[PDB]
Design a protein around this nucleic acid. Sequence first.
DNA 1: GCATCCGTGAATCGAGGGT
DNA 2: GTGTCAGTAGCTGTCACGGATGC
RNA 3: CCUCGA
Lengths: 49, 1114, 93, 49, 292, 88
Amino acid sequence: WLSAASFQETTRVLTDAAINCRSDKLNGLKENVIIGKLIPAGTGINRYR
Amino acid sequence: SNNSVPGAPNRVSFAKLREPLEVPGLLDVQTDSFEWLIGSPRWRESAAERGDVNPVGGLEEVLYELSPIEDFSGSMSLSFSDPRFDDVKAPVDECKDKDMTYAAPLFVTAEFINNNTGEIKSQTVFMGDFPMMTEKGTFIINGTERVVVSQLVRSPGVYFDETIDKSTDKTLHSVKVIPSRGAWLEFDVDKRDTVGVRIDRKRRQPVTVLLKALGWTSEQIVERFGFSEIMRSTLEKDNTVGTDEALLDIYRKLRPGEPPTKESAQTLLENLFFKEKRYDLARVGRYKVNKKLGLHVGEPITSSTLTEEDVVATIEYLVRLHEGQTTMTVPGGVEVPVETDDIDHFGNRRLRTVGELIQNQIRVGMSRMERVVRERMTTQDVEAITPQTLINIRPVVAAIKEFFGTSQLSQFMDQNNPLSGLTHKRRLSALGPGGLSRERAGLEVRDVHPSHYGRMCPIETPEGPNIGLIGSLSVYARVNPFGFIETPYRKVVDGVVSDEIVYLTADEEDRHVVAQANSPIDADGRFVEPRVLVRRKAGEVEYVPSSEVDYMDVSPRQMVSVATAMIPFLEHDDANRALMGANMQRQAVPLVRSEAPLVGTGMELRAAIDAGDVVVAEESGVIEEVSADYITVMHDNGTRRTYRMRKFARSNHGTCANQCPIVDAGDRVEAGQVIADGPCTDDGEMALGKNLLVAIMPWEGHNYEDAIILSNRLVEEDVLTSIHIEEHEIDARDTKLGAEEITRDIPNISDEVLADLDERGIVRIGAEVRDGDILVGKVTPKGETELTPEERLLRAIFEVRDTSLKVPHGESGKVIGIRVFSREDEDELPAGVNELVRVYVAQKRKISDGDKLAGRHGNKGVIGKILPVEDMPFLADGTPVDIILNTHGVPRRMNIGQILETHLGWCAHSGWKVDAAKGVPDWAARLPDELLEAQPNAIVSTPVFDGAQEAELQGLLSCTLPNRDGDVLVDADGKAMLFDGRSGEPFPYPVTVGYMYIMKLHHLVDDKIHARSTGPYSMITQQPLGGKAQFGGQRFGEMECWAMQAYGAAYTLQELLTIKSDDTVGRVKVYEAIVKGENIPEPGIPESFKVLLKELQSLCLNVEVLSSDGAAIE
Amino acid sequence: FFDELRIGLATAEDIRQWSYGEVKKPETINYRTLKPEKDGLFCEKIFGPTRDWECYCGKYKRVRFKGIICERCGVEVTRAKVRRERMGHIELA
Amino acid sequence: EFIPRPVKSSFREGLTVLEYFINTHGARKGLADTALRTADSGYLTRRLV
Amino acid sequence: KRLKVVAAFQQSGNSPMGMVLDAVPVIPPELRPMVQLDGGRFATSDLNDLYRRVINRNNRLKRLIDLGAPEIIVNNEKRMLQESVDALFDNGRRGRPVTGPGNRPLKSLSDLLKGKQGRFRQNLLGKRVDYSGRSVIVVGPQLKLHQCGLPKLMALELFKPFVMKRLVDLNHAQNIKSAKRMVERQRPQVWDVLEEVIAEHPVLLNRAPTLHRLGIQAFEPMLVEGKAIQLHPLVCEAFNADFDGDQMAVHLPLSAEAQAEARILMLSSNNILSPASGRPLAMPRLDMVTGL
Amino acid sequence: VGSTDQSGTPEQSTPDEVNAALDRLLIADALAQLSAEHRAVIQRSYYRGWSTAQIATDLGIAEGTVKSRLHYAVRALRLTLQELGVTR
DNA sequence: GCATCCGTGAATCGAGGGT
DNA sequence: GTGTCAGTAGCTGTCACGGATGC
RNA sequence: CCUCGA
């Protein structure tokens, strides 16, 4: 829901997120970029990291 | 000869068409508008000879609409008349210095009429400080020159629209009756073949509801609109019937929530559209309606209001248009065509200038006072009331201050060079209040309209997001008292060109047909060819018999702007590069010394003189005493006028406005002659650049795609050196723990940095200051409870802090002026300030690697390398070239003007001599006799769309003058043999060589260079600041983060978004880790993300971070 | 390293569990003393001290009083960083 | 639609007064829609991203 | 579609009562700051007005309830409290927006996150960074493909802490504190010292718009006089960068991993081919092809 | 008068901690060259902000003992800083 | 059951100046 | 403490598109 | 938000 709320229709996405009580698995490029984690790609994947 | 009127240098033109009318005052748009507003004697005499009957100044029109002021009863009355001005409060230049407003006190004559006592007291009431317009058409608000820009607005009147439905695919139609003020009224035909009307944006009522409210029976309605089935179906589908029934239906939809009285709705439905209080079509709004409907076409414009007759004839005009009718006569009216309007046509698109734009702000201020007056009348006694007691001028002065202070039309004046300033005063802006929003401007408002011919230039327009929304007034164009733009035309009687000139509006021009300016004309006036290029209604261009031409264009350059008319060989440059050519001339930088261009257009004289940055003699006389400081002129009658030169003045954009006298002591000077010229001026002509010896060749890749290589001669001889001045400012305030004091005594500062300061802490005049040096030493006392523990220990182990004025990064020059303002010394500072110091620093900027140069044809480029004078490819006689332009970036852009300009430029530099023996050659038969011979460094004119033809240019190259040794260096093709200064071998092939006028643009690396290690951070987001002036960093945007992810540089991306940005502890540990030599620590959590969570919470959303086990972590 | 980011509807009990106090008065600050008004939108008892370790009434202005709830003004004494994280609330009638 | 009347002149020959004006209709709309054609392009790009 | 909403409240275990609020939270003050103007007057955030207008109406409701005001005033007041709270969360969502001074719609909490100026796109997907710069670009034919030229004054500020460290090591400065005053005053010792610092320390060049990944490439900086960046003529195609006033930004990788990512992944010599088509980009393109 | 959301109002900024971080690094170096007694007294007077009697109560030493240790430890730090060229 | 009307979206970075 | 009429400015000169909202 | 530069 964090990768979707940052794309389009922010209020429309955050509403459905709170109704469904959605949990965001912080495992994605757009999501980790936001919080400051290493992106799971390139040198960030567990094989090279 | 070119421009033989004031006494200018003799510039010879390649002109084939004579100029019947000389260019008007290019600054008239600002002048006539303001003179009309205040009713100056010059404007009244202009309207007097114009034929006008009962003209009205701008103030008189607002005061007459206001007078008289009466309460509900009518026992008391107040009226205003005769507005007059006292002398100006402070001169123009003094206002810029002391940060005040240029204004003149406004007096009116008011009197109180008492109906219950039959006695009146009349007196003079001071209304308010009235902002005055400078002679240059500018205002001065708080010490800053501003320019009120003319606004393109939708003209008042009745307009019809033909829209196409999306789903039903049927042709719909709509009508708008746009008043100059009041409520709006739009009729429409929906997809059900019924007619309605929306009153002031409100709900769409059936069109018959309005007729029933006016007292029209349902039978008489069927009598008028019976010929259409869509109107018969409207009265049938109607809900309520009855005159007193639909009248209440309108009231509850217009003013909901109120008890509906038969006379409370009868009052406003008459006042909103037929009483002059809350509705008014200006004298132009009435006239525009009287033609579209074809009624009152003979009545003098006296009715400033809408009538029921107009509404009925309007609905008749609409319903016929819907069902294919093409002709209609109003009952008792002339025949009129039935069509839809453009709203982009310059006959329906109106231009309101400074006077009108100001009048509305005075009108709002007066109306706000009028309501206070009526309340103060019924409160005070009816015998001790005077005009002084009834008048509260507070909302008036706050209305003109609100406008000039905050308005999209009060714009910071462009003051790079005089041409940039002149164009700004002639701008036509579509944006603003009452116009449209930038998000509300389709691809149709922006493109060129056929009615712009001779009125608005189709070239000069920004290429950014404001393209098409901002235009420049055409050269010969003018504005009528109605607001439309008039342009002159030559009346053709019977196939004969006449010197009679008449100005036509947009719609007036369409009712005739006009010939193109460059039509072949007999010496008597008869056209040579039967068929001539003719512009027709609806923007139709076609040939037509000579016996059909009614008018014709005044001059070829009639359609272009002032800057565009300054592009030589303009007819050979595409609009794209021409747009940049004209837009970049306004970006020219005033050079130390100015050279007039060899190849000109003729506009350079009037553009410079009408700009107002030169010094022209008002009356003829002789020069009694002339100095670099001032010029004194002794007239013939005996009076003396002394003109003071503006020396090393800071422009709005940092350029140097410096005037220099031209005439000498004891020089006879005629009236209107230039006695001193300022920046970008030479003997009265705009000198926006320098004449440079150009070679068109690639050179070792340093000029690769649009880069420029320059000779160091331009550095050694200050050919392209420019002066720039920055203003630095600081103030001494009262703080919570005392007061900041400006002192030379600064804690923990050596005596070596403070060596250039006087005893006050101010830098002394003449000192050279680098960046970081102290200019004004100010210390502010800091409390003890604000000290770091280390700062307190460092204070214990060894109360004011340093707030000195230092030189910002990247600034450097000589301190030329200081201005000090002290509250102790009567200086009026804002409350809480005790002293204010402004330091002026001047820098002499030589041309540097990366500075942006450009020509007049959109040929731009930065400086890629400045070779020494010996490395440059030099001509046969040893003279090295000055600038090398890559050839590849020439034939793509379609800017051949530089090629024709380069050739003519050389012929001007060398001179020519046409073989006169054995007759005049066949190519120069059309050339004036003044061009058959030319001395070196001759000045020439290539008028736009006239001027030198390629045939005549070819002939001049054949008869170019030889040099001092007797050798002809360039060939008839225009190319010449150059020698490589680096190797010595001559270049294998001949190269195009000539002289081109190059301007130094205001995009210099000295200003645009920037770098940042650390610096300020925004308090909320904790991210680095932005902009060079704030010492900010660059923005790694969204697309740039995609690039790191695309590379897979994950760690670099985290580094960018964490330790290098908003990691509060991570960025510091990086700074520590660098000076220690340790490794870079691990990035933390961005403080900006912490803010995001706290913002989602503020919306009643419970966001939580869970660990791998499931426990929420704080 | 934290795995999941959970979002949900905030119960009225959560809204009160976050808030360090209710915003009763509508005032903002004083326009002479620059002191935020008590129980206002900037109440120091609720959101936090304007300056570090400085209370409203002025009794505790030193670092030695770390964690002391002032009795005369009710302001805690931590860094002004908490004015970036302590939430308030309005109890609706 | 194409104008039933062409631009006969070449830039070497020299456009007529009306020729330059009639050229600007397409030239300005050439710049106008180019800004719009880049806006829809960049928006499509971020949806694809 | 109704089941899509109802089943969400069923499984998750949260009550639908949360959609109706009994208390509204107050955002911390630093996120709604009130700033002072140089004229003595004050400028505040719109949220303070929005929060303030809700409090006024909420306090009025407590008066009306205590005073036993007519049911028409209590009910007609609660609506205003509903409309006021509706504006605090998303002003303008229903009806006409709450106008401020000048008929300007006030920003709401939900306006803080929408569009390009919202928190997500403006302050989360892209921050603005330290250790960065920008200047005019100029072609440098003599440069090798892996080289770029940055001005001396740009490199000095970018490597300021690195210069301070070495100035204090070589004993040009007594302490690291005075090493800073030396760089800020631009003492002549730094220009010889700066070369040791920037030695083989790659930098990143970026030209907006960054359309594809070849819009950013890594280079070895070369100290040049003047104030313009010197760019290799072969990378102009990737950047789509002509030289008529174009500007490029420079970013200094700090961490060891960041330098390795620039040296290997982003170096201009390792990115000759277009990732879209496989055909070369750093090839003779304009004047160069004509010469050949 | 003003709204921060409204344009034309400058955003608040906070300077960087470079000067503070460098001083902290030099103070941490001069502190390490002190005796455990002197270091544990300056860190209780300037870093913890206690009174003279409060440090005397904690360390179990006399009142004048804390005054004397502080008096020397400050001069000891001034010795180390002036030896490294720290500006007065 | 369907036409209407509501809400969502509309490229990137950069300079300087006013209130 | 308040007490005869006592009544916004501004504005529509964006548009494609989908689906809940509503007759 | 006014003007402007790729």
